[PDB]
Design a protein around this ligand. Structure first.
Ligand SMILES: [Fe+2]
Ligand SMILES: [Fe+2]
Lengths: 321, 322
């Protein structure tokens, strides 16, 4: 079976490279034939992900969570062991899971997966088992592009970011708020109900957990870098949750404006942060999901998000070490 | 190529009026000709032996299928499709098969009929062992009509009062979802809304009375509803209720299991008699150790199930029928 590089309307190109790269089928197709081609074309696929940063596989027989798991298995990347610092996860089969995000009417900001975690995924997979009735795409953007445009537009700001970095403040409830963009409580965050084991697992993850009165918790993280270096592609990337926090960490316990600051406490310039948001939207690519679609994302080069949608919609995921 | 479905004995099974519980079907030891076992051969035999299998489930209440090539969720789904029961209208693994978010492994899940407090509950249930537990983790099952007959015999007055007033179920919900709780789901998620008006309207549709607590949560009161039902297909009364389940298993920071369920008229249940019922369930139950490939078909009108504590790994998928 052949893996054909196919053009789609939404994709962009950077230095002659498509973003995202799109592979489609040209013996009747079957899941085993696909997973077999994946193993056979390992090198080709590694080079494609290396050049593009994300690869969308469209037109293949991935009709269930089990099929998706088999495809993830064919790529052979080591699975990311679950710890904490993420959201209420629900394992479906094997390395595949469903995480409960914010409501369909909301817009999930751009971010790198588990960006504030020490051992974050190098790669992730997204699978559409049930396409959204309307909207619900998973827009993606090249992190190094965002950095380059930011350094070009706001050299001083970028310069200050690499000197002082960023500081993150996030208040947590005891339980999980299904209605919040950042509704995970400290119980689910640290997979514990004991404050001792929590405050410890918290300090380990590199946090300053101070128990709140209403049984919640106020977490503070940083200073930590805002810019990182992709060793495999020799370039710097916008690896931070600045825009995500500044515009999305909003609920009864969190004021977005105070959710993230420069590493030295100094506030961020509202106009520059929103200018960054503008760059993310302009450079992003929002491919409408089709049932069977499997998207492979290199977490070092891409930030993802989610658009509002009308149910039904079901996108499963898988994280790689 | 044909396959024989042989009624086989196992150590754990019991017998009531000459009928095995659960009935156990396995491939034969030495058949002529020797059949090459496969999933497709099994699913074909299931369709071919429809009547025989319906009769078996009818007489026993539950049927364990042991020794067949059910080696994946996909295989299990094919087996569920071969039986042709209508799927119960709604984490989905494949087709009609899913994984149930159960309690932690160290816990003991109480006996219950599936979706017992739901208007349209499943008539039948399928359980499949994809990965056998390292230790324990069986799925004990017991005959509901037997529990009823023993309860009526030991506590006639109590049963008589149950038929008269029935039971009342209480749950104090928080606004958000508590992860560390067997009943931790809040009213926002339970009623899929953050709007109080809509929520209390949806609870009423579900045959529930909702009262908004002062702390931002909610208190629901379901009932009075019957504690005893009638199995039309078998002409007998069954212990179709979550009495023991709620009285001993619905505990968290907001809920006290002793007020979680009461008589339909508010009167508390006698602790002695409830624990006596718990005793009966344990004595009458059958806990068959799970084996990879096992498929258990349960008639939800005649059987209550549970789960023993266990040491991971363990993986049992499920499927519900209209
Ligand atoms: Fe994400
Ligand atoms: Fe159950």
């Amino acid at each position: 079976l052949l893996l054909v590089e196919t053009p789609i309307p939404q994709q962009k190109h950077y230095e002659s490279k498509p973003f995202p790269a799109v592979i489609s089928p040209p013996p009747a197709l079957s899941l085993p034939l696909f997973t077999q081609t994946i193993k056979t074309q390992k090198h080709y696929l590694d080079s494609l992900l290396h050049e593009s940063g994300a690869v969308l596989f469209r037109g293949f027989p991935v009709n269930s969570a089990d099929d998706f798991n088999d495809v993830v298995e064919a790529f052979g990347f080591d699975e990311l062991p679950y710890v904490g610092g993420a959201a209420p996860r629900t394992s479906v089969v094997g390395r595949v899971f469903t995480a409960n995000e914010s409501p369909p009417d909301q817009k999930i900001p751009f971010h790198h997966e588990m960006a504030q975690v020490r051992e974050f995924p190098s790669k992730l997979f997204f699978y559409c088992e049930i396409e959204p009735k309307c909207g619900g795409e998973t827009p993606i953007v090249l992190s190094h592009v965002v950095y380059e445009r930011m350094k070009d537009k706001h050299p001083e700001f970028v310069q200050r970011l690499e000197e002082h970095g960023l500081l993150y403040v996030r208040v947590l409830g005891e339980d999980d708020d299904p209605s919040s963009p950042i509704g995970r409580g400290w119980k689910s965050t640290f997979l514990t109900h004991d404050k001792n084991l929590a405050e410890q697992r918290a300090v380990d993850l590199g946090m300053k957990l101070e128990w709140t009165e209403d049984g919640g918790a106020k977490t503070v993280m940083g200073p930590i870098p805002a810019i990182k270096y992709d060793e495999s592609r020799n370039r710097k990337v916008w690896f931070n949750s600045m825009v995500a926090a500044y515009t999305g960490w909003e609920d009864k316990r969190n004021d977005p404006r105070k959710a993230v600051t420069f590493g030295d406490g100094k506030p961020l310039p509202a106009d520059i942060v929103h200018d960054c948001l503008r760059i993310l939207e302009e450079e992003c690519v929002a491919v409408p999901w089709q049932r069977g679609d499997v998207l492979l994302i290199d977490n070092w080069a891409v930030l993802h998000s989610r658009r509002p949608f009308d149910p039904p919609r079901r996108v499963l995921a898988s994280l790689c070490k």
